[PDB]
Amino acid sequence: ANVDEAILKRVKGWAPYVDAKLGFRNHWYPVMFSKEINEGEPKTLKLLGENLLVNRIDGKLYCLKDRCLHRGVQLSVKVECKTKSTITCWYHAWTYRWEDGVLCDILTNPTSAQIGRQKLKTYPVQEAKGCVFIYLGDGDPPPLARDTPPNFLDDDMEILGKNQIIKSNWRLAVENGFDPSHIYIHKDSILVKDNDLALPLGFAPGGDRKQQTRVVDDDVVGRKGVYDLIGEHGVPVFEGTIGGEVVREGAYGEKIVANDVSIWLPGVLKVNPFPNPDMMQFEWYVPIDENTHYYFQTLGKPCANDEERKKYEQEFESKWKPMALEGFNNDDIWAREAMVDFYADDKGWVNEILFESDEAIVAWRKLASEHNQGIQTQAHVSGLEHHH
Amino acid sequence: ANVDEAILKRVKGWAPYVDAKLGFRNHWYPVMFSKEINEGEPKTLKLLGENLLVNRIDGKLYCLKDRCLHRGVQLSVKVECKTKSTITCWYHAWTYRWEDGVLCDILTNPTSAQIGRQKLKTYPVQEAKGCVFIYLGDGDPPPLARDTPPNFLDDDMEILGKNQIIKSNWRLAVENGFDPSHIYIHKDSILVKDNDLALPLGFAPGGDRKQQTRVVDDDVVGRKGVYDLIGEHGVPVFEGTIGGEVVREGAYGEKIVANDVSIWLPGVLKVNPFPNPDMMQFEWYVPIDENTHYYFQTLGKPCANDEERKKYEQEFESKWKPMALEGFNNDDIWAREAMVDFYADDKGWVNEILFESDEAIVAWRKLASEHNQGIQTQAHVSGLEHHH
Amino acid sequence: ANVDEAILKRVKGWAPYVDAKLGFRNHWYPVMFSKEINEGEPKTLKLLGENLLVNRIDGKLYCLKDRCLHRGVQLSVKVECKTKSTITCWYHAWTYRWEDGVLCDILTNPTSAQIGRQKLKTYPVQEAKGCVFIYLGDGDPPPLARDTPPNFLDDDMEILGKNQIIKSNWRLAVENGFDPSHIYIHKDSILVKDNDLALPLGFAPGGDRKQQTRVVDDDVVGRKGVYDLIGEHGVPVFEGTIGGEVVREGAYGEKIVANDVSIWLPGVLKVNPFPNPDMMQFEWYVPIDENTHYYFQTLGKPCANDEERKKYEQEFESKWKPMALEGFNNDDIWAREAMVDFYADDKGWVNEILFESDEAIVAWRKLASEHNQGIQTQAHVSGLEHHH
Amino acid sequence: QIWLKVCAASDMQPGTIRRVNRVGAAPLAVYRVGDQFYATEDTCTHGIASLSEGTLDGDVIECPFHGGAFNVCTGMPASSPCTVPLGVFEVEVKEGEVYVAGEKKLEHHHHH
Amino acid sequence: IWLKVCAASDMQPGTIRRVNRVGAAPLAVYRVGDQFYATEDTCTHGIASLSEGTLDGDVIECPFHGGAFNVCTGMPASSPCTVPLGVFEVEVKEGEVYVAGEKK
Amino acid sequence: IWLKVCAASDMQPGTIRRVNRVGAAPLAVYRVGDQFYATEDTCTHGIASLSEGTLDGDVIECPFHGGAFNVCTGMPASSPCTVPLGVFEVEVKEGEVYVAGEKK
Numbered sequence A, B, C: 001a002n003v004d005e006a007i008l009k010r011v012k013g014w015a016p017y018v019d020a021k022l023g024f025r026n027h028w029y030p031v032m033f034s035k036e037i038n039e040g041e042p043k044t045l046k047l048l049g050e051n052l053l054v055n056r057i058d059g060k061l062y063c064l065k066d067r068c069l070h071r072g073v074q075l076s077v078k079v080e081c082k083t084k085s086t087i088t089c090w091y092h093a094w095t096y097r098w099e100d101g102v103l104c105d106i107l108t109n110p111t112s113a114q115i116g117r118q119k120l121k122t123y124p125v126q127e128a129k130g131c132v133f134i135y136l137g138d139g140d141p142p143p144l145a146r147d148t149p150p151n152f153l154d155d156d157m158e159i160l161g162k163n164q165i166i167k168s169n170w171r172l173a174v175e176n177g178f179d180p181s182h183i184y185i186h187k188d189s190i191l192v193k194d195n196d197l198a199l200p201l202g203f204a205p206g207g208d209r210k211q212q213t214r215v216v217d218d219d220v221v222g223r224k225g226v227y228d229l230i231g232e233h234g235v236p237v238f239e240g241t242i243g244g245e246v247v248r249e250g251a252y253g254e255k256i257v258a259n260d261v262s263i264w265l266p267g268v269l270k271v272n273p274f275p276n277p278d279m280m281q282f283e284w285y286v287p288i289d290e291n292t293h294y295y296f297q298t299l300g301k302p303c304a305n306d307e308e309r310k311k312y313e314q315e316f317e318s319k320w321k322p323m324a325l326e327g328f329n330n331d332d333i334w335a336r337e338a339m340v341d342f343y344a345d346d347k348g349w350v351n352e353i354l355f356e357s358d359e360a361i362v363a364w365r366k367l368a369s370e371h372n373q374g375i376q377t378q379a380h381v382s383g384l385e386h387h388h
Numbered sequence D: 001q002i003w004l005k006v007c008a009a010s011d012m013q014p015g016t017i018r019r020v021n022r023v024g025a026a027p028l029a030v031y032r033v034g035d036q037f038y039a040t041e042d043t044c045t046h047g048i049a050s051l052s053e054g055t056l057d058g059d060v061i062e063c064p065f066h067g068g069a070f071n072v073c074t075g076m077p078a079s080s081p082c083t084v085p086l087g088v089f090e091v092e093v094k095e096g097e098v099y100v101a102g103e104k105k106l107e108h109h110h111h112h
Numbered sequence E, F: 001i002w003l004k005v006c007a008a009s010d011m012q013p014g015t016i017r018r019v020n021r022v023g024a025a026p027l028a029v030y031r032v033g034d035q036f037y038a039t040e041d042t043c044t045h046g047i048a049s050l051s052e053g054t055l056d057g058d059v060i061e062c063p064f065h066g067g068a069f070n071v072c073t074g075m076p077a078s079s080p081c082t083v084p085l086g087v088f089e090v091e092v093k094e095g096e097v098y099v100a101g102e103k104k
């Protein structure tokens, strides 16, 4: 456990989720874009608290844990790839194969008994839609589709995006993203006026608890997630009042967006259609360490040919990225950061005072608790400990 | 429970005081000057570890805890006062009344069952002598006079001052201020020469322990404090010697100051007369968190009309503030800071080696331990806890 | 202890060493060069976590703990040496003798009962070879010779050096320095080429484990150390291969250096001859606190007269200092820093995967564990604790 | 209406809880402590949890969300983080049939 | 030399009595069971009065910081005390308590 | 093919015995009760000699970092060990212990 047992004991409906401060192990996670990693140019990154090294050899990606088995230094301090298929630690020259992590040579002692008898941790790496996904887990990985939202991998779905490091636990990012009522913070986004969007300030729930969402655990692909259906029976708020007097109004644009929002394990949201009626948004909140995450944003738009892909890419740079990914989502960034203090000591998970629209968040917490493939622990980071 | 129980058990005479790392709850504390808080201009501050918001509406001051009941974000990240008598959290628009903290509206869901069934914490606030006092406590507040030194509230006493944040626990500031022997650090202050002050280097106590101070716990308004009477039977030190040879002398000025010094709960010192024979100094050491405090300095001088008040104000800005509040007390600031390391781990409360003049400080420690109105704890900051 | 008992329990061969994160008490340590402290000019420094003050009075050095007995402030915040043989605390004027640390006077209360009945901690200080050594221990100190490598104190040995603060625990520095295989990190040093040195990439061990090192448990002066004998029967590796292909070669210079390398308690390395056939290198890794150390480098060369010493001094500044002390050892600095994370949580002491050449490090760890004169604890820093 | 028919007193075992949904109103929770029946709002005052899905220990109901609790007889908070009192509804057994009031009790016209 | 303190019965078992001495530091007389002992009253660690402390067997605990001393040897029994207390041998003759005038 | 270790009676139950081989890596012979087992002496996690460790039942604990292996199967029993230990065939004939030259 990564959290005080007294707290976990109190949270009977989603203790595993609360305990998963470091993220869920045995899931695929996007960490960079294919174009960011060149042939023979190793790149470092931290995923779920683990320091990793990614390299492209003969066009294919390989992932090695960035920590020599010998004295635990990061190989990346001084990269020495002496042959196309290996990397040699700069310290005592222990050499590892990129494909299987096997310690194949030691330049400081070619007669060492450790040669061929030790193996550096490797992780599966797969590129899809110009995105680099890493399976931070053990054993043969499941198909990538299990950890991706519906349609992301569609043949003609052109994926473009942006990635950066955000200072907040991944869970605060997830819940902010799937939060039905947080739409309020986007009321002044330039995207609203500049793209003539229809956007309420919130929702007056309607129907029973079960009707508030659609829990998906019967997906043939294995996907596990939740759909937010607060808008099916709820009355959208377009006139916000105080004391019965209207103080704020929603956006009365013509473009209808986000009629279906869904969150999927290990932590990826799908907003459709967004930021335009003919587009979709897929964003991951990838755990780096307990205090940070990658905010991996992608926008998808069907494209039949290079012409459309080019015009889309062109439109991405000039409008969507600056007006949507940035102009709209930037407020999500400081919103996440604003929740850090309340949850930093883990007490926020007990003292939070939820209201109706949080039913969606609750459903996600339970789904995540029930269908995650493993709880990452600090011991996974330093080295598993046991006595048997 | 703010300190290791092993340490507290060792301190039989003033354990509660050593435990009061965050300060004493249920007392009035000055946090700013009236002119610093304008109409409809919310100001943030941290008091006893709690983030607070203060606002002036129709001239009156109101204080709300700067933490939304929903997801615990500070309302001040993006202040939204949509109506004169309320503030709306920028996240999901939960709206509260400054007047009683009641959650009166929720723009994102007007049908929410939470509306009218939740109340944000509010604290009493009142202005006196141009100073803003906040009652960081629960229930109906006691008269302000109880937590102020005698004469601070006298009709003709014109109060002026300065406030700032100092990096030291509040108790270190209190003790340095009420310390009879620390006068040594002020031997070279510009105020000594520039205002022709008589100032010894220290004191050779005379008489018994009881005579060294006067414990006040019979005051009618209920104020509790201690008067330092060391100079009543003790010989002032004007010739500092080492091995019997004079190496330093005190100041032989004409103005007699600091005839009586007293410290009062929750932590305010009174030096009379100072810095001039016709003035008084009242200074508070307000706890912000365990590592910092507000150094709330005030100088009082009787005035009978606006003519003298304006005169005093001009003398304050050109002489008293720079020559005394700063020229004299600046040494107190780094002196307090110099004791941080020794007490930071709470070990200094055990290892300190006191001498005779510290009898005054010990009296204050015992008085504070016995008459404080409550020990602020981390639980007060995050949310009081209790299991059936 | 200083480390999790569950960890110490696992390390049966050198638990005390792993526990000694703050260093070994009751040993001499160099902290500065003689020319760095002048007559009547007190100097501050931190050794084994303790703040100390060193002063030169009538040519002789004296060391006092830089922490007043009264309120625990550092005397050095505002130095007041009012008589040649004393120092007066700037706070309440408690005065101490540099000679024995006795509290001889208190300017603020000349009649105090504390005078002559309290004593500030003092540590023995000795100058040798232009180096300042402090005995960070209790009771009468042993000969300095016990804590120095053989020949460092030879009558004709001329010592010149450099000192700086490095960000790594002292042990990581000691192990890197005595590490037979770390020579690999020096393969591109300017010294190797500019001084035509022969330098292998490493060693293929030969003989039995017992032949890999030579432990000296006792000397005529009680020295405790270990000599690295890997090159006695080992095969120097000049060509590094990966999968049978040569990817790197050692240096085939003509100068043979580092005939013998030995590490001695409390943590000083002797490389002979180095960096030139007619010189010797002695370097200490002095514990400052748990995260940093003094990298005290010295180069020695026998000199019979003033002409030789002068010539050597010239060569040191123009060649050896920049080409060797810096051009060669700078790589050791970042090598040490690279091991910080792995051992920072004390887990590296369990998870490290050693190979053959590490027998030297293991021998050092056991020797240090068995012959150190005491484990410095945080309690030594704040004040020893014992409850009846 | 004034009295809401819930069930037969015999359909509830000691130490159990029953949720009572009402048309156009918030749900109630009826608890059986021994052979006595008490009722309160079903929704925890600390959030949106259903107390009838919680754990009843004697006369104290524990919310499943955050571990808060209430005394089912007085509706007063028994464990943090709960601070707001539950509305309490009178229950009575007529002909072995359990009835719960349609309106909550008030600090109106009772013991001083 | 010797100074008459009081009648043995004036002190209940396990109690402490401060003995003021004009022109000199006060002393502390401890009654451990039916045995009597005496040391300097002022804790060697500060200004605390040991006679206002707690006696546990023949060990006096200072009320200020929990430091302690063995009232028979005067040696520190608990930190932060490090300076040995001054010991004064006591004499009980005819139900009368006398404390030596000199240390040791 | 086999090597003479010692007479079974020379080893008390629960003890370890290092078997040094000329021109080869050392072996470790353990006696668990009345049965004998053998494995590589060198811990797979480093360069420690398991014969200098502690035997608890059929599990040997390395003196270096506390890692452990089951002496019967040679499989890792405690972290940080992960690499299986090479196990060697042992025979007891005429009250004497014999260890196979090559691992099984």
Ligand SMILES: c1ccc2c(c1)[nH]c1ccccc12
Pocket: A177, A178, A180, A183, A257, A258, A261, A269, A271, A274, A281, A329
């Ligand atoms: C409603 C409308 C838009 C959005 C939403 C809910 N959730 C989102 C998350 C990321 C980007 C856009 C949205």
Ligand SMILES: c1ccc2c(c1)[nH]c1ccccc12
Pocket: B177, B178, B180, B183, B257, B258, B261, B269, B271, B274, B281, B329
């Ligand atoms: C003696 C003389 C002056 C002062 C004092 C004691 N204590 C003080 C605290 C604040 C400002 C001045 C003084």
Ligand code: FES
Pocket: A068, A069, A070, A071, A072, A073, A089, A090, A091, A092, A093, A094
């Ligand atoms: S730390 Fe990598 S080879 Fe030694």
Ligand code: FES
Pocket: B068, B069, B070, B071, B072, B073, B089, B090, B091, B092, B093, B094
């Ligand atoms: S955090 Fe304030 S309304 Fe949700």
Ligand code: FES
Pocket: C068, C069, C070, C071, C072, C073, C089, C090, C091, C092, C093, C094
């Ligand atoms: S802290 Fe040094 S004399 Fe008071």
Ligand code: FES
Pocket: A350, D044, D045, D046, D047, D048, D049, D063, D064, D065, D066, D067, D068, D069, D080, D081, D082
């Ligand atoms: S919702 Fe019931 S304790 Fe929080």
Ligand code: FES
Pocket: B350, B352, E043, E044, E045, E046, E047, E048, E062, E063, E064, E065, E066, E067, E068, E079, E080, E081
């Ligand atoms: S004054 Fe007695 S233990 Fe400190």
Ligand code: FES
Pocket: C350, F043, F044, F045, F046, F047, F048, F062, F063, F064, F065, F066, F067, F068, F080, F081
């Ligand atoms: S060398 Fe055996 S457990 Fe590490």
Ligand SMILES: [Fe+2]
Pocket: A176, A177, A182, A183, A186, A329, A332
């Ligand atoms: Fe958003």
Ligand SMILES: [Fe+2]
Pocket: B176, B177, B182, B183, B186, B329, B332
């Ligand atoms: Fe002062």
Ligand SMILES: [Fe+2]
Pocket: C176, C177, C182, C183, C186, C329, C332
């Ligand atoms: Fe080196």
